[PDB]
């Protein structure tokens, strides 16, 4: 069927969670084992929220190259992401080894440091431009060297050096500061301009390794980010715009890694997105 009017007739039936439950039930189940082995325990911030061994991103290290970290490779339409989940305080040196190692130019954050009282990834960046960052087990420096406070989101640029070789590269930080605590946003007008924002800055292009976009478990927030772009990619690149399949996608995503859309809501909320999205680009 069309997405718009599928819509319609899931809302009216009442039928979303159904849905959402065959979408789980037809995913994708593959190994990962090394994200299971003892010595990464405190490298996972929760234990049902793994990489598959497959399309792991693996750091470019001897001793232990695991990171909580997804490539999701979109075939057709041409896109990649990494997916992760928010640094935990013993990875954050992981975390920009593999923003240097993979030569991504932008970092997409769609949580809050602290949400219902608890704390949901680690201070990973520096919050004033004189106060850098050091990180001695990975043997990067990082530095604030801008921002601009939006009422919505935040953009910070941020200098990272490899210490080791004194090279220096700019990085983008794309911070969505407002989705609420609980549940999804009432429109999807903040988060498409916030989207748009992404992908004007270059960061999602192919001169530029793959995007990082995090939440908290890498999963929820940041399956919905990306499930938007690529289906919007899509409907630009067909001869059918109709034809997009917004499950199909998802399941093809759900290939790559565990959980992509945590709830009905998301799910609905992603429908919301993509259909009032297309729009806008005529
Ligand atoms: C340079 C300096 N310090 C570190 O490590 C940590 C940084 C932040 C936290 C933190 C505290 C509450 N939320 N996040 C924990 C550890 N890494 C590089």
Redesign the pocket.
């Known amino acids: 069927m069309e997405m718009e009017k599928e819509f319609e007739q899931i809302d009216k039936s009442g039928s979303w969670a159904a849905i959402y439950q065959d979408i789980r039930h037809e995913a994708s189940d593959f190994p990962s084992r090394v994200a299971k082995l003892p010595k990464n325990k405190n490298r996972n911030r929760y234990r049902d929220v793994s990489p598959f061994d497959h399309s792991r991103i693996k750091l470019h290290q001897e001793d232990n190259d695991y990171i909580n970290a997804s490539l999701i490779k979109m075939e057709e339409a041409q896109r990649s992401y990494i997916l992760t989940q928010g640094?935990?305080?013993?990875t954050?040196?992981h975390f920009w080894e593999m923003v240097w190692e993979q030569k991504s130019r932008g970092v997409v954050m769609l949580n809050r440091?602290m949400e219902k009282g608890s704390?949901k990834?680690?201070?990973?960046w520096?919050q004033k431009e004189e106060k850098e960052?050091?990180?001695?087990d990975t043997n990067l420096k990082?530095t604030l060297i801008s921002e601009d406070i939006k009422s919505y989101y935040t953009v910070r640029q941020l200098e990272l050096e490899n210490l080791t070789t004194q090279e220096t590269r700019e990085i983008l930080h794309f911070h969505y500061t407002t989705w609420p605590d609980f549940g999804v946003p009432e429109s999807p007008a903040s988060f498409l301009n916030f989207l748009f924002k992404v992908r004007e800055s270059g960061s999602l292009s192919p001169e530029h390794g793959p995007v990082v976009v995090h939440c908290s478990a890498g999963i929820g927030r940041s399956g919905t980010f990306c499930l938007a772009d690529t289906c919007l990619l899509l409907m630009d690149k067909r001869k059918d715009p109709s034809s997009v399949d917004i499950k199909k996608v998802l399941l093809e995503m759900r290939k790559f890694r565990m959980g992509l859309i945590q709830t009905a809501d998301q799910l609905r909320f992603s429908y919301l997105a993509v259909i009032e999205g297309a729009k806008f680009i005529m």
């Open positions: 640094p935990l305080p013993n954050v040196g440091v704390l990834c680690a201070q990973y520096p960052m050091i990180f001695e990082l």
